[PDB]
Design a protein around this ligand. Structure first.
Ligand SMILES: Nc1nc2c(ncn2[C@@H]2O[C@H](CO)[C@@H](O[P@@](=O)(S)OC[C@H]3O[C@@H](n4cnc5c(N)ncnc54)[C@H](O)[C@@H]3OP(=O)(O)S)[C@H]2O)c(=O)[nH]1
Length: 140
């Protein structure tokens, strides 16, 4: 049920993200295959039509808590592309679980007690969007 949509990244973007994870000595890094950015997180399903663009060129580190109560480190971006794709889903009827869509790439879903801050230049190039059912229990 529901609908989840995310974007996957080009090889060069993935390399840069992994370099970022290594630079930060991040615990529980998201594995390469699981790096993504959510576009839709909807409890209702709509006929969202999935999509060489750089979609973002920088981001800031932000800590978000997860459902399980762990601390996740994300690279939070301003992305006109991702925000417009999120709004397309909304126009179709999709729901979202936060008051603001804040596009991000989760770098670790469990950073323990550590703290991080920074502003990075990362060329974020999308390879493809994918859609599937909403998996409330998804993990990396
Ligand atoms: N305060 C605040 N927190 C925010 C804000 N935006 C987000 N967060 C939180 O940040 C967490 C760390 O990412 C996060 O924790 P979750 O326990 S709900 O993570 C579960 C995660 O599974 C991912 N996933 C992969 N595939 C599927 C699938 N098929 N269905 C469902 N999920 C899927 C997905 O990536 C997703 O996280 P996401 O953040 O991309 S929506 C959020 O709750 C905000 O605006 N504000």
């Amino acid at each position: 049920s529901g609908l989840y949509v995310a974007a996957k990244f080009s090889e060069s973007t993935l390399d840069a993200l992994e370099e970022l994870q290594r630079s930060l000595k991040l615990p529980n890094p998201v594995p390469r295959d699981k790096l993504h950015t959510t576009i839709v997180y909807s409890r209702v399903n709509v006929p969202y039509k999935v999509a060489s663009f750089e979609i973002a060129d920088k981001g800031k580190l932000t800590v978000f808590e997860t459902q399980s109560g762990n601390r996740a480190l994300v690279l939070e971006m301003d992305s006109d592309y991702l925000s417009a794709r999120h709004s397309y889903a909304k126009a179709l009827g999709a729901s979202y679980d936060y008051p603001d869509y804040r596009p991000h790439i989760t770098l670790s879903y469990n950073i323990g007690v550590l703290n991080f801050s920074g502003e990075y230049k990362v060329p974020v190039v999308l390879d493809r969007e994918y859609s599937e059912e909403l998996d409330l229990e998804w993990s990396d």
